[PDB]
Design a protein around this nucleic acid. Structure first.
Ligand SMILES: [Ca+2]
Ligand SMILES: [Ca+2]
Ligand SMILES: [Ca+2]
Ligand SMILES: [Ca+2]
Ligand SMILES: [Zn+2]
Ligand SMILES: [Zn+2]
Lengths: 543, 351, 543, 351
DNA sequence: CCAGTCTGTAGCACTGTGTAAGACAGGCCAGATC
DNA sequence: GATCTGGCCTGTCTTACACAGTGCTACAGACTGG
DNA sequence: CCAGTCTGTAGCACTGTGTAAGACAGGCCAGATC
DNA sequence: GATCTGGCCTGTCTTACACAGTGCTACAGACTGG
């Protein structure tokens, strides 16, 4: 059998194969055995041309806000036409990207297969499902450091279709047509913009991302018209932007960073007012009200002093410009909790509420004997930082009864036992893929579980939490049930997705670049987008 | 006319190619830091001291009744000269914020109290502009004038983004010169009044201005439309014959073909021009001197100090006027390793 | 219809394909279309096991000199058992290699196809061609610098089967059974030893190469018994070692290096005695007599002074240890001649025999006006060294009449015209692949052409060649007819072959290493040997 | 007992971990350069000068009647003490050449004339060895003796390559200790005589020796066979009761467990031992002192000077004895970048 | 028999990587000298 | 008898050049249907 | 039904690369003082 | 009214960790023939 040209494109991209190499091996297998097993080069590229964005004609109702209507543009030069005159801020920065709209329609046409399969399964009619569509889009931006070559930093903006549901025609609080099953695996994290800048400087980052932001702020208004399965249908869109680490969350949101005194990203509590009472707070922070607060800072309509207004406005000091859902990142989410139980135990080996002034060395003694201790029982070598593996293995009731062995009193043992027990009861409530289905039991108990945890910390270990509270802990104790109810999960929006993409990017720089930085980006982006299309994974079945 | 290579002791990651230097009451103030105001300096304005070639920066504070300012990058500064009512002030409008948006909101900066111990207090009163407001833009120029006996401000030039009809997300960073309608800004109230003149062929950008005794002179600037930097020096004469601000203009013969210049006032009306860029590719290396009176500009070519080879062989460079013939210039340090304070500073002085 | 496993191995190696990548693409093409187009992994490696050395049982008549008879050893650790005891010279140096004999028999059994084809063509019987075989082996060693990775120098010893002829049973001065047609193309340059050392230091280089040298010195004595085409047959061997640049030729030969006063590697002439009379010399230098001369130096059996013995022995100062055919290298062979005509012309623009003392600048003037001159007519940008391309294009009668344009006199013009004419008459005599076939006309004239050239240099341009002669020029004027008659060609032994192989080695280190320097060299050597076997090129036909 | 870090002014790529220092007539001579003799030094022997921590090397010349020597690497040196016939000499045999082959030919090195101007003349007479010849080997030891009253040489120890039967091109760099038959070399003529002793259990390697008044003491060395470095000090007493050189020996109690030692003579029979390596992995860091007389060795542990950090934390190191308590040691400089003179030198002296 | 049409192969524009041919310099030695 | 300088010579840096790879592109050639 | 024989996948041994979590210092401000 | 130091805050370096690829290897698992 001759082989499907799409399969050949996938087998060139899905395994990082070169282009010359592919041609040489194709000529080999051609000349050897009597058959055209792999399609030739030019026809493979031609067969690819409809997978990239910029091929499927579409319509928009109404016309978009300040967005040209052309539907065939490919890779736009990211500079967006900087007047190169060297008297202004330089036109140096190199970047390449698609247009948001066209990339989205390309991905949607890709997913046409699964949307039609879901319409078949749900047994919904076809002449009656042309309007009520609802697509959730999870975006994610990050900085990638030190591209490995002998052009150091980079930023990569990537979005992912999270869930598509139907609306026609009743109340339909939810009719899940397609819920992506691997929202973290980089196999589905579509790049949309690449920029050879550094994550830090707010100038060039905003200067290049601006157009994408305008696309976002224009697109949530109108609705989309796309011909799929022979029927032209209308789509809506929600943009639950989550894919940011805390630092970028603040930089986009305007608050100072990072070791601030306005810890929470959702409430308005400072260090103390949350340290004292932990688990009693409500979600307040919003994007629009953060704009409002920034206005109240800039105009200072009450003539208060510097620190006076800084307190009145809750640290808002810079005009935010990218609406971000302030959701906890379940990826780390525990290094703080882990090292905090670590400090609890390093202050349990020595009696800390009877010796509240250790030396530079007595804590060294207690941690070192704790380290040899947990090497004895749990076989955990000394580490520098609470990475994921050590965090998982240490935060166990086994190691808790192991740290019981060296603490003299027998009431502290039971206290830390109950603490670790409630904490393990409450961890998978947030790390689950969907606690609405995996384990809603601990979710319904999470409020009371967390309150007992807070009461135990405030009655037993408040020797340290008078006015001090580690950042992660506030969000993990106060808002978690609220967040889970607000979204439906926590782990199902981790930035880590785009994080796993990082490898791919640098890998694609080593084997498929042009290479000359005007074209190098363009080609890396093209190959990435090829590698992350549901179509060319459906052909790599590998049963 | 001599240079001394300075050094950045600390606080060096805080100067960007667009910035401003406010010269008033001794010490000078840096304005327009890169990135939003940090916690170390909740205002953003810096005080800058020069001590045996060392360039130190200290954190200014603010008043209580004043507003707080976003660090505009390439705005138009205007020394509102010391006189009634509250001397002495700086008018700032409007530049573009560290998010690529523009102000359209002029600010009045003044000093309040001192010291006690080598300390200052400033205030930044947002002054409303009514009218007939001017559009937000960057690179234009403001200049104070005073005639029989009213004190007003003349504002002209500047680029902007495309007006929000064809502003497309493939041209969302293209610029075009604002329409040449000079604005007149009355400080109190902000009854701005726009005017036109058939001598305003095309609005230019980055064109250093000089106002004296209700007569102003605009020197060579940049134009994107014709892509030429014309040599036509411009003069304009305004007069507040209340209730009408009647204005006229005149082309003159020689106007230097330079853009992005650093003007240092030495005498009462003696201005030494270092100048940034002659052509769109090679920056100027020489100097200039300009007197002025009711006759006009008196040109001169003073002594061009020999620049180091490093500065002369660099593409771009910028700076500000320390005032009183002293001025600061800086070049992007091109080489490994990026410090990352990649801007080497030279202090340059007349005579 | 499945594909030949050998073809699949070739298509994994002949295009630098990885191992994981190959498996992934194989699983893809398997699961997609109904057939097993590429063999699986383990069976491919199993099918390869007989291509590497160490598979075919062979015999040696008689038993070899101090060489273990085992015939199945694979990749030997190169150090050959250095006593790791720290007090001795360190056992650090890392190297890997085959055994000379086993690698040779592997390559021979590879070439079994062409040897049987040649026995078919020549119409020779089969029961009467079991003894008289004659294999010529061209070896080549060199240093490769700065392996490019995130272990700086390296040395690579490679041999190549040059020509195999028959001996049964008459006089048979030559019966060419197989003459390799690309004796320089890296496609046939088989690596045999690799060592992570530096080219310079004689110590470790000799220490590791020693065993190979002892093998070769033992192998020219006996004969080999190998079963090919069903018949077991006996082979002889000659080793025309040529693959060395001048510097290594000296280091192995013992003579000082490099800008010595004993220029020639064949005669005994110094700078002067060859400068006065150029083209009248006879090849003298030999390996055994160089050993003898080194003995005469060491014992100093005539109590002569330092310089006096240094002259009596003709620069022999170090015991040579690797018999090397002293052959001209045709690769550069002209950079000296090129820059020498360049100096001739830079001294013709000025009048040099009337102004024998130019300034630091007058020569700069003359060269610069010559450069603008040849830019006007021959369009040759100023360069800093006489590379290959500039040497080809400049050494032309056109550029010679172009340099006529600025020289005032009209007799020097005709002199340099005849000079360049004879030089072009004599260049392809040596750069040919086989002047016995390509152009023997100029070969028979080469003696007379060279003498006219020498007479013209001594009558016209001897203003410079009183006692000075560029090294290359002596070998190019004196022994070229002797050499061509000695071997049959000049270009057909260029080291450049292994030189090209260099750009392979780095490549293999970048994509196929293990990597950890114990196994890294093993893997690189294995893949190289796979890539250079006539068998797996016969399968990459590519008509 | 003090160290000074020296430096390599120039000619630094010419010292290799195996080398020798000939101490005679003031200046000392370096012997055993890496790579064959260049043109700059047609002999190979160098003269070494130490001047305010600087280590300079100059090119010695030779006689006319003498042979020329291949730069052996780790040979056995023997100070043929100043006496009849032609004082004072060095006996060198036999090491291994820069091609991995061995000499089996002893050389006598002597001085001829001087200066005129800070210049020397040397001679290297190849002295034939008849017999009963010794086998070529490296790391063994030679020493001079004088017994009633004949001056002879005792030679013992040493590794070699496998004898050329099992010498295979997969073992062509393996070594095995020579058979322990001590040799006696008569300097003229070379009527060498082999002898054995039933206390010569196993021939060792790199074992520093000390000969005095026709009685010799062999200290600890290395052995590959048992892979142990035994502590059994050895003594042996030879006597030429013509026409028979009758020899006996004796094991003694204490012999230091060190190999590759640097012995400096200070007194008439006082030898300070720096020592290279205690165990097969960690080198020794301390020092030792050894007197000797007709009683035997008198041991002592003198003051071990504090070494620097890098010399103590390095794997290997070596050197020679400058003579008169002065000695040179060197460490392979391990770090980026390789100079490529990657051997740092320290001068170390007693008292 | 010849047009159309595909396909392979050559060539273009770009920077990174090894080489080694010359720049050189300085340092010793012979000479030139104190 | 002892000390410095042009000659030269060779070990060290450096930089013009060749070329490696990559994808994109255009022509030439060879098949294939009329 | 049962064994041999294949085959896919997981796991091992190894350095090299990014990361960012802590080491930290030092420098300004408040405090403590001249 | 003018000057120095402990507190602490934060921007800077560094180093333990994860883990990426790569070939080789061994086990389990599943086909397929008796
Ligand atoms: Ca990241
Ligand atoms: Ca981050
Ligand atoms: Ca070479
Ligand atoms: Ca080479
Ligand atoms: Zn909160
Ligand atoms: Zn010759």
């Amino acid at each position: 059998f001759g082989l499907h040209p799409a399969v050949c494109l996938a087998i060139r991209v899905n395994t990082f194969l070169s282009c010359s190499q592919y041609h040489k091996m194709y000529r080999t297998v051609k000349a050897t055995s009597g058959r055209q097993i792999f399609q030739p080069l030019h026809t493979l590229r031609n067969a690819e041309k409809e997978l990239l964005p910029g091929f499927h004609q579409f319509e928009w109702q109404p016309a978009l806000k300040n967005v040209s209507t052309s539907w065939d543009v490919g890779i736009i030069d990211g500079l967006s036409g900087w007047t190169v005159s060297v008297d202004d801020v330089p036109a140096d920065t190199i970047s390449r990207r698609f247009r948001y709209d066209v990339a989205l329609v390309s991905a949607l046409k890709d997913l046409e297969e699964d949307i039609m399969e879901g319409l078949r399964e749900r047994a919904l009619d076809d002449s009656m499902c042309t309007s009520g569509f609802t697509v959730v889009v999870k975006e994610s931006c990050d900085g990638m450091g030190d591209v490995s070559e002998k052009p150091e930093k980079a930023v990569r903006f990537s979005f992912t279709i999270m869930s598509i549901s139907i609306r026609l025609e009743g109340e339909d609080d939810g009719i899940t047509i397609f819920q992506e099953q691997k929202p973290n695996s980089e196999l589905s994290c579509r790049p949309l913009c690449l920029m050879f800048v550094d994550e830090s400087d707010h100038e060039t980052l905003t200067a290049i991302l601006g157009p994408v932001v305008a696309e976002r702020k224009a697109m949530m208004e109108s609705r989309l018209i796309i011909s799929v399965g022979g029927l032209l249908r209308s789509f809506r869109f929600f943009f639950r932007g989550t894919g940011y680490d805390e630092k970028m969350v603040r930089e986009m949101e305007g608050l100072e960073a990072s070791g601030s005194t306005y810890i929470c990203t959702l409430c308005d509590s400072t260090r103390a007012e949350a340290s004292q009472n932990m688990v009693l707070h409500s979600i307040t922070r919003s994007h629009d009200e953060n704009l409002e607060r920034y206005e109240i800072w800039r105009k200072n309509p009450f003539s208060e002093s510097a620190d006076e207004l800084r307190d009145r406005v809750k640290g808002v000091s810079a005009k935010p410009f990218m609406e971000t859902q302030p959701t906890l990142d379940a990826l780390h989410c525990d290094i703080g909790n882990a090292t905090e139980f670590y400090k609890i135990f390093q202050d349990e080996i020595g009696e800390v509420y009877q010796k509240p002034n250790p030396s530079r060395e007595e804590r060294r003694r207690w941690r070192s004997t704790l380290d040899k201790q947990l090497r004895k029982k749990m076989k955990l070598k000394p580490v520098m930082r609470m990475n994921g593996n050590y965090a998982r293995r240490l935060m166990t009731r086994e190691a808790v009864e192991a740290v019981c062995e060296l603490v003299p009193s027998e009431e502290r043992r039971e206290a830390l036992l109950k603490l670790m027990d409630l904490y393990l009861q409450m961890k998978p409530v947030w790390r689950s893929t969907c606690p609405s289905r995996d384990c809603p039991d601990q979710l319904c108990q999470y409020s009371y579980n967390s309150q007992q945890f807070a009461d135990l910390l405030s009655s037993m270990f408040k020797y340290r939490y008078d006015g001090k509270i580690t950042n992660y802990l506030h969000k993990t104790l106060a808002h978690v049930p609220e967040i889970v109810e607000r979204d439906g999960s926590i782990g199902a929006w981790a930035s880590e997705g785009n994080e796993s993409g990082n490898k791919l990017f640098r890998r694609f720089r080593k084997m498929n670049a042009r290479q000359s930085k005007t074209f190098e980006l363009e080609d890396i982006l093209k190959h990435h987008w090829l590698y992350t299309s549901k179509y060319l994974q459906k052909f790599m079945e590998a049963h | 006319m001599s240079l001394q290579p300075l050094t950045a002791v600390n606080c060096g990651s805080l100067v960007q190619p667009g910035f401003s230097l406010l010269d008033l009451e001794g010490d000078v103030y840096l304005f327009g830091q890169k990135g939003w105001p940090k916690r170390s300096c909740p205002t953003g304005i810096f005080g800058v001291r020069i001590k045996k070639g060392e360039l130190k920066l200290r954190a200014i504070s603010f008043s209580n009744n004043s507003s707080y300012l976003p660090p505009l990058r390439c705005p138009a500064i205007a020394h509102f000269e010391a006189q009634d009512g509250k001397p002495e002030c700086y008018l700032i409008h409007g530049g573009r914020t560290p998010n690529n948006e523009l102000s359209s909101s002029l600010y009045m900066l003044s000093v309040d109290s001192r010291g006690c111990n080598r300390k200052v207090t400033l205030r930044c009163e947002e002054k409303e502009l009514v009218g007939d407001v001017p559009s937000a833009r960057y690179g234009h120029t403001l200049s104070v004038i005073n005639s029989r006996g009213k004190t007003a401000c003349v504002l002209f030039g500047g680029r902007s983004y495309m007006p929000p009809t064809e502003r497309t997300t493939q041209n969302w960073n293209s610029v075009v010169d604002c329409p040449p309608q000079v604005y007149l800004i009355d400080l109190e109230f902000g009854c701005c009044t726009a005017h036109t003149l058939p001598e305003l062929t095309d609005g230019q950008s980055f064109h250093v201005a000089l106002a004296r005794q209700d007569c102003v002179y605009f020197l060579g600037g940049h134009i994107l439309s014709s892509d030429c930097r014309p040599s036509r020096l411009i003069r304009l004469h305004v007069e507040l014959l209340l209730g009408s601000p009647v204005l006229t203009c005149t082309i003159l013969h020689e106007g230097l073909t330079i853009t992005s210049a650093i003007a240092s006032p030495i005498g009462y009306h003696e201005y030494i021009i270092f100048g940034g860029y002659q052509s769109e590719t090679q920056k100027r290396m020489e100097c200039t001197y300009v007197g002025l009176d009711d006759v006009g500009v008196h040109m001169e070519s003073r002594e061009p100090p020999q620049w180091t080879s490093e500065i002369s062989h660099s593409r771009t460079w910028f700076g500000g006027s320390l005032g009183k013939g002293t001025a600061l210039v800086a070049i992007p340090s091109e080489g490994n390793p990026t410090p990352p304070e990649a801007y080497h500073f030279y202090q340059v002085s007349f005579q």
